[PDB]
Write a protein that binds this DNA or RNA. Structure first.
Ligand SMILES: Nc1nc2c(ncn2[C@H]2C[C@H](O)[C@@H](COP(=O)(O)OP(=O)(O)OP(=O)(O)O)O2)c(=O)[nH]1
Ligand SMILES: [Ca+2]
Ligand SMILES: [Ca+2]
Ligand SMILES: [Ca+2]
Length: 341
DNA sequence: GGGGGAAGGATTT
DNA sequence: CACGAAATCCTTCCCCC
């Protein structure tokens, strides 16, 4: 079982770079301006020239402006990146059929066939990096191991613009040397729940009774960590398919006024439908980010599809339902459509 | 007891 | 201060064999 993971480097930043070469070399920060005030918003991502000074995805634009005032700040253009991504995903098909597109810039290729050992894998890794750097002028980091989880950790260790093979000899030492927090799927919250159990490496999972672990982190993730530590993880690569579409927007001000909110909620629906393009959804949820970044949502599943007019009608009710309960002001508002016909 | 759908959340990338 | 989008998993509630 040989898995090849491809991760496009500082993707958005790099695309903006590609589209305007003069930018290369300078510190670039791709932003998402909320429009509340001046420079309100957050960082979608940044290139390494900015990354090394602490400017990273998540921080407010204002905190980034404070660290690197003379860096280039571009608005985020999601659509563009999307089409550059897909074109690259096509070039990857010319190397395998068994492909899983995890995100806008991640992909696992099952190449157990077209190879047989790692020496001929590290080669296909270079055939792919170079191929991509050529047709689209974009650098990627390749990771190669026996399963998706390790294929990915490989890339993490080798980025940016790198390639790495995690055979088996080392997979053994990693199950003991790797910090549990650096395991895909283990977030900050899960990483911390694992300290209170004495789990600081994968191996420590074998030392704990399964039930005390299922109670702390749930069964799924428990069976996940164990399988990996017990070195028998083998999830397959498969074609993932869109299950939901949506959009959440930020309001210029926080409010509880229905008539003051409806315009944002409607614009969200309008955009969601544009993206739905031909897909008919049976389920709708109205999501809201309260005044203290807490996520609230209400929904309804219908026996039939949902016409645009129905959606308008329903969303207004679901929002009212939200204001009925939570007495907190609303900062962000949006919708999501699922259960397509 | 346990299937199976719903809904509202939690957590991760 | 602190945007966005989508997946999976969890706990709870419910109708009913
Ligand atoms: N709006 C927004 N976009 C994000 C965020 N994190 C990642 N993205 C987007 C833009 C990133 O270029 C893209 C790929 O994510 P990583 O692959 O997580 O980001 P990036 O490629 O810059 O770093 P990397 O190549 O993985 O070392 O996803 C985020 O927190 N907010
Ligand atoms: Ca990544
Ligand atoms: Ca990446
Ligand atoms: Ca992690």
């Amino acid at each position: 079982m040989i898995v090849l993971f491809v991760d496009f480097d500082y993707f958005y930043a790099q695309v903006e770079e590609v589209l305007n070469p003069s930018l290369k070399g300078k510190p670039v920060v791709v932003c998402v301006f909320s429009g509340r005030f001046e420079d309100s918003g957050a960082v979608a991502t940044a290139n390494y020239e900015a990354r090394k000074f602490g400017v990273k995805a998540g921080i407010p634009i204002v905190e980034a402006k404070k660290i690197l005032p003379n860096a280039v700040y571009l608005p985020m253009r999601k659509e563009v990146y999307q089409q550059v991504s897909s074109r690259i995903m096509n070039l990857l098909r010319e190397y395998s059929e068994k492909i899983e597109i995890a995100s806008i810039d991640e992909a696992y290729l099952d190449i157990s066939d077209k190879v047989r050992d790692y020496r001929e894998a590290y080669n296909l890794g270079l055939e792919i990096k170079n191929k991509i750097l050529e047709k689209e002028k974009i650098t990627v980091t390749v990771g190669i191991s026996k399963n998706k989880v390790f294929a990915k950790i490989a890339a993490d260790m080798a980025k940016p613009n790198g390639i790495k093979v995690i055979d088996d000899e080392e997979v053994k030492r990693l199950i003991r040397e790797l910090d549990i927090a650096d395991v895909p799927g283990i977030g900050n919250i899960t990483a911390e729940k694992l300290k209170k159990l004495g789990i600081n490496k994968l191996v420590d999972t074998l030392s704990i009774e399964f039930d005390k672990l299922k109670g702390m982190i749930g069964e799924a993730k428990a069976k996940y960590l164990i399988s990996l530590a017990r070195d028998e993880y083998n999830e397959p690569i498969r074609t993932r398919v869109r299950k939901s579409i949506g959009r959440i927007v930020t309001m210029k001000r926080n409010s509880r006024n229905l008539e003051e909110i409806k315009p944002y909620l409607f614009r969200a629906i309008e955009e969601s439908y544009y993206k739905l393009d031909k897909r008919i959804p049976k389920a709708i949820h109205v999501v809201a980010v309260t005044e203290d970044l807490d996520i609230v949502s209400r929904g309804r599943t219908f026996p039939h599809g949902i016409s645009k007019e129905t959606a308008y009608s329903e969303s207004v009710k679901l929002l009212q339902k939200i204001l009925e309960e939570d007495e907190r002001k609303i900062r962000r508002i949006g919708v999501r459509f699922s259960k397509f016909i």
